[PDB]
Amino acid sequence: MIRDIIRMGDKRLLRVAPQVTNLGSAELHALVSDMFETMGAAHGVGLAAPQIAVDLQLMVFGFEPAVPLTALANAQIEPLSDEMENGWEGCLSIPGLRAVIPRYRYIRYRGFAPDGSPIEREAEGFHARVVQHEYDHLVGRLYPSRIENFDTFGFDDVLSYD
Amino acid sequence: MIRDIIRMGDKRLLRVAPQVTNLGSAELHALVSDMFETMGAAHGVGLAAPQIAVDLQLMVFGFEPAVPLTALANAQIEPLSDEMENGWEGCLSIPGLRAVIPRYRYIRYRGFAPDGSPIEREAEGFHARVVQHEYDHLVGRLYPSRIENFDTFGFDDVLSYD
Ligand SMILES: CC(C)C1C(=O)NC(=S)NC1=O
Numbered sequence A, B: 001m002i003r004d005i006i007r008m009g010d011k012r013l014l015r016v017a018p019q020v021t022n023l024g025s026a027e028l029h030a031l032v033s034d035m036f037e038t039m040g041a042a043h044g045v046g047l048a049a050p051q052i053a054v055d056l057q058l059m060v061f062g063f064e065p066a067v068p069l070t071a072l073a074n075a076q077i078e079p080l081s082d083e084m085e086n087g088w089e090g091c092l093s094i095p096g097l098r099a100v101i102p103r104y105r106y107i108r109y110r111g112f113a114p115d116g117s118p119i120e121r122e123a124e125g126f127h128a129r130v131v132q133h134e135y136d137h138l139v140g141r142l143y144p145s146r147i148e149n150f151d152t153f154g155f156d157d158v159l160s161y162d
C-alpha cells in the first residue's frame, strides 16, 4: 500500500523518532513493505519512516555504484574519518529541489533488519550519503540546514551548477 | 507585457546587477510597466528586475499596512537602528515556499523614480522588509541564505509555524 509522503514544513518531519520495538512482527513487515513500495512509486533511493508520518527509527533504501536494498531499524552512525564530500541531495518531502550538501565520505552504520537480525556495514560515497540523509530524518534534521553554498540550492529542472 | 519569472537555481539570480543609466527614457518606462504587470499577474508585493532576467538595479513594489506603489532604480539602503524583526518571506522565484527571515525593522532607502526624480524614504516593518528583500535580488542574495531557524522553512500549503 503506497503512503502519502509528507512535505517540508510539516511539523512531523521535525520530531525525534523513538526506537522500533516490534522487530520480527507482521506489523513491522507490513510497514516496511509499504515503505519500499512508497519509495519506488516516487522514484526514491531512500525513504525514512517520518517522511510518511510514521514516528519511528526506520528507513528503507537502495537500487539495482549499486546500494543493496536495505530496511534498517534503530540506525546508529559513526564517521570513519574526517573526509567530507560534496554531492547533490534532494528530498521527496522537498520535490523539485536540490542543493550540494557536504557529508562524511566514510561511515559505519549499525541497526536491525526487520526480522531482528543485526546489520552492520561500512559504507562510503553515495551509499554513505543516502544513509546519513535518511538518518537526519530520524532526528528531525532536513538538508537545507546543511547547505554551506547557497548558490547550489534551487529547482531540479533549472539548476546549472557543477 | 507579462514576463517569465525565473526560478531559484537560475544562474541569473546570483549576479550583481549594474546600475540603471536610462532614467526618463521610453525603454525604461516600458520595462517598469512590464514589471508592475508581471508583479500583479503573479500576485507579488515586490518584483526585482533580475527575477525576470533583466540584469539591472531596478525593483517594483507596493499594494493598496499599505505600501505605496513604487518603482525604484539604483536603490541604496541604510539601516536606521539595530532592531531586527522576524517575518515570513517567500519568493516568486521560489513558488510554494517560505521561511521566517530576520530583517532590520528600520531603514532608509534612496534611488530614482523611472522619470529621474530622486526618491528617499524612511521605511519600517513590512515596507522595510519588502525593500530589503528586493534589494537582496540586486546583489544576488536569496532568502534561504538568510534563514536562522530551519524549522520555519517549508511549503506554503503545509507550513504550521507561528
Ligand atoms: C542522497 C539521496 C539522493 C537522498 C535524497 O536526496 N533525498 C531523499 S528523500 N532521500 C535520499 O536518500
Ligand SMILES: CC(C)C1C(=O)NC(=S)NC1=O
Pocket (backbone or CB within 6 Å): B044, B045, B046, B047, B088, B089, B090, B091, B092, B093, B129, B130, B131, B133, B134
Ligand atoms: C517580503 C515579501 C513578502 C517578498 C517576498 O517574500 N518575495 C518576493 S519575490 N518579493 C517580496 O517582496
